[PDB]
Design a protein around this ligand. Sequence first.
Ligand SMILES: [Zn+2]
Ligand SMILES: [Zn+2]
Ligand SMILES: [Zn+2]
Ligand SMILES: [Zn+2]
Lengths: 62, 113, 116, 672, 95, 98
Amino acid sequence: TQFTCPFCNHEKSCDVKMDRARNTGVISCTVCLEEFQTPITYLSEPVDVYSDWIDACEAANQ
Amino acid sequence: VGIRFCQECNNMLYPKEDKENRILLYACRNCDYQQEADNSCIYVNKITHEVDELTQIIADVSQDPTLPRTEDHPCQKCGHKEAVFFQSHSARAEDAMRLYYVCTAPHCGHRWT
Amino acid sequence: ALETVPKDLRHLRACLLCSLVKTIDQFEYDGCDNCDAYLQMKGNREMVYDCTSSSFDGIIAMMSPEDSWVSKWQRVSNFKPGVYAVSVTGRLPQGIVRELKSRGVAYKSRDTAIKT
Amino acid sequence: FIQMSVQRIVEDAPPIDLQAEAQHASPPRYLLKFEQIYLSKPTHWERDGAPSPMMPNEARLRNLTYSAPLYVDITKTVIKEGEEQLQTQHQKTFIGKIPIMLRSTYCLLNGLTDRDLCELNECPLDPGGYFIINGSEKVLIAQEKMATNTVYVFAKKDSKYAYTGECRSCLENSSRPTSTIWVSMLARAIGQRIVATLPYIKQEVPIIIVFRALGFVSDRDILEHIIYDFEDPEMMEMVKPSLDEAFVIQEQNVALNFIGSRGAKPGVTKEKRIKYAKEVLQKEMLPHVGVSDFCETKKAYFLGYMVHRLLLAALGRRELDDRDHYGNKRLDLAGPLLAFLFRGMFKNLLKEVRIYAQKFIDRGKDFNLELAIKTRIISDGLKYSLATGNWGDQKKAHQARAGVSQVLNRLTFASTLSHLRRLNSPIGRDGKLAKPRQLHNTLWGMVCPAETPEGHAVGLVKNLALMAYISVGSQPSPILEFLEEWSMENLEEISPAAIADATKIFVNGCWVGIHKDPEQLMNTLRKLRRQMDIIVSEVSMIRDIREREIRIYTDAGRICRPLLIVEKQKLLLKKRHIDQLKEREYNNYSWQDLVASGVVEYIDTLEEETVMLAMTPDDLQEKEVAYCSTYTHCEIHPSMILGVCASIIPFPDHNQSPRNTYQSAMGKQAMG
Amino acid sequence: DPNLWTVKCKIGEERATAISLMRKFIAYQFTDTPLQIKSVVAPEHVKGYIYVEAYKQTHVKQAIEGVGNLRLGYWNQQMVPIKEMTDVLKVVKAN
Amino acid sequence: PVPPLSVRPAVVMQRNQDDLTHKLADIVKINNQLRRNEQNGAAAHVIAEDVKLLQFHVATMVDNELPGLPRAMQKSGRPLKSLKQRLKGKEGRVRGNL
DNA sequence: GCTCCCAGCTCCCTGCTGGCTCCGAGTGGGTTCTGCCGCTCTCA
DNA sequence: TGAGAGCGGCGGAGCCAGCAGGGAGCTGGGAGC
Ligand SMILES: [Zn+2]
Ligand SMILES: [Zn+2]
Ligand SMILES: [Zn+2]
Ligand SMILES: [Zn+2]
């Protein structure tokens, strides 16, 4: 459930919250307070949300 | 049963209700292709699993050297004396000591119990 | 400019004024990359001994004097990229210090090591 | 081993290329190719040099190691930054010395006559087959194991899985070890979903995701590889749950990300994930079916077959495989054991040579290959593993399995003979599971039923039958060339429409193709094997009739026995054969001619499942009250089912069976 | 400010490695793939590792790539605590 | 506490020190390193690593086998016989010698 | 401003999954094995 | 500064602790007056 932050590079500083009611997976860093939201399916895992966040960060950086 | 693929994109059709007409229709998940149903039946489950093994019996099994063959039971179709006989394999069989006979002669292929 | 980095680990000295670490041969040949205009250390082994001290603590590689916090900590943010020691122990001769003061160059000790 | 396997291990090792660090410059490449081995007969190498042939008796007396030095040739081609290649070759480079087996084709006693052996203070009656190390005899006990490249479906008790289908896959004795893959069905809210445990992946993956990742994006296409007959609603309704679990991933790339994310390596950037998953599917998953630039269609067909096999077992159509059935066992003899050890040991030598060369070229001065190779690592390593018994690297001696290569028992000739013919099950002793220890039906005529140690290893250490022969293995290429001439179509050409009615052909476990006519092809293959034309005697060919598979096996370690062939209730052995054999000293008409005549056959356990045997020709092939009228083989003599120590008991059928076992154990201790 | 990382190095060779690192930086500062790290610090009594200043650990991994002395520190590098930053440069020393 | 020589005797001919003496040597060696290192360098990072290794060595003196931890190995790889291993089980001090 | 009823928070309970220890008693032999590379300082 | 050499370092079963999910039961905000 924890991952290394891509922005403030703090290991285990990322926590993932699953909201199945709205079908969203949210990952928050506990150091730089970076917030990212991405839709999830019923078959989804925190690694998928982390993967989605890293892809969005790479796309934002082009 | 009648499990039927989408004509256009080749995928499983899913059952659906047309609520305005309360009519069962088979609709693809991917295109708007729809079809009218002809069995009102969707899910069927034989819990007792009274399966007729004669559907699964293959005539080619008559070529087995290790199987026993007899002439006391003649074929009801062609009257041929020689016939190979063997039992069921599955635990689900309704009769444990059920004996299946396959006609030994080529191209009769008659199978009975 | 590789002239601001050592070619070998023998007879290394540190400039007492800017903490530049070079071989004594480099100091003799090309002088100090940051003090030769005020010292004229080229071609004078005795003057090299006077102004550079073989004894120092630490090694720091410096690449971005304008973009390094260690440059600010060491007060070397206006010096050329090179091999810079963390602490250089020693003191210049009094005559050279007075000459620098007369020119207008204040002499601050590079021995930032905590004593006792 | 010493003829083919050492050469292929040396040649298939990748060439090493290594450059410098560009010191001050921030640098060139070279190849160091090994190509051909040259093996010498054993030689002394006393302190002075000047080699002379070492006689095994001398090795025993002087505590030497009866070994033979081997040499390899290396061509090192180095290019420099000026764009020019310098190619220097070295012949007869000393790599090490391999301990050699007595009376083998490379021993000094090979081909000698009895008078010559008596001159050398050697016993003509000594069967050899053992190594001499530090002047002590060592015997590599054969080690049994589960067969490879074959789908096994088991049903473990009290686990989250109802049924699991596994296929331990290996290439042609390549560097990679057994890369097992599991396909399991969950144990039933909604259920009976199917997951795959594939190598280098942390979490199990649903099968339809793997199929999507493999390159099949449609639904009918995926189903065609699993269900061969769409007219079976039971299979459709059983597989649709796992199919609806994958409703959300309709392209290859998303599935590729799905696999890469679940990697055991740290999981960070998109293309990294894609490449990792593609590599896992290309080389780590199912290697035996093919590791090449394009094997996706063949890999998908085999995976679909495993799922189909799992569905059949879970539907009761087929029966779960038995772990004790000797058709699923393989015996590693000296050859495969030494090959497994030598592969990793040669790799270690290459790594040390690479380290030495890199250290010297960091300064950019020349490296010397003579000092680069350490001749000690192979020779002293082999000597250690065969002297202590720990099969593996010395640095991990606790992890390595022990008990292999025991001291040859030299109390009585029967003891020596029995020790040379011994199979060991590598299962933990002092276990409370008695099923592996029981005498299984498939041991008939291949493992002596009387002879086992009575201590804590009852039923684990077992002796070999008198006429049992263990296959040595051969290439399946000629069989493949023959098959596709005889109206056999590969998977890449057939459509799944006709895959239901035809029979599937397996060669060494890999699904090669399909054929429309199952019967007259087995006849042709039987004729070839009885003529030895294109199919050697060891190849075993099994046709399953109820289940349309027909399998061909050419692996090593399969155990088999000779049986007389029967045609229409009559032996093929006639008076002329016996007449020729009875005068054998003058006509050199040996057993090999009898095999070549098409009279006898070698049958292993898999083929013995589908054969009809006759205990005695005269007494069981006659007109009487018919029991069977379709006997296929006959036994040469029942007394051949016993072993070596159990073949000295007079009237062993007039005794209680525990007494026979006690005599088998006690015959090894009788003084003579 | 860029982050400090400890990169594993051979014992007794750390000094030559730092000089070699700086030399390679200067050489690569004119190429399409320059060394994006900032500075290298080799204290007097630090054995088996070197301090490196970079914003991203990926920059550290790429910059130290190809260095034999840092092959053990190639796969993993350790985040220096921020409050410990002042102790990287702290030097202490009659008798 | 370090036990006397009777608890950890040294054999005369194959001096080969006891499996416990080698662990004692690792403990004292790393103790001196940490002592000296925190005396002068006081770098606040190597102290953490030194403490971790010292706490690993101390723990594996008494209990060599732990879940999820590497076992201390003698040269030729064989794991050390800890005090708990000496005393635990069928061949031990209590059940096998008392 | 008054009493009171309905949702939000507190508690305990139940249920489930991961982690540690045990696996007969004696006896006799034999065999292998107890690290290794090299790197810097000293006597010559 | 080279030889001698000192050593420096490189399977299975069955009990206990934590976690997760789910109700009864108490207290502030609104329903009536
Ligand atoms: Zn962060
Ligand atoms: Zn459609
Ligand atoms: Zn008929
Ligand atoms: Zn200077």
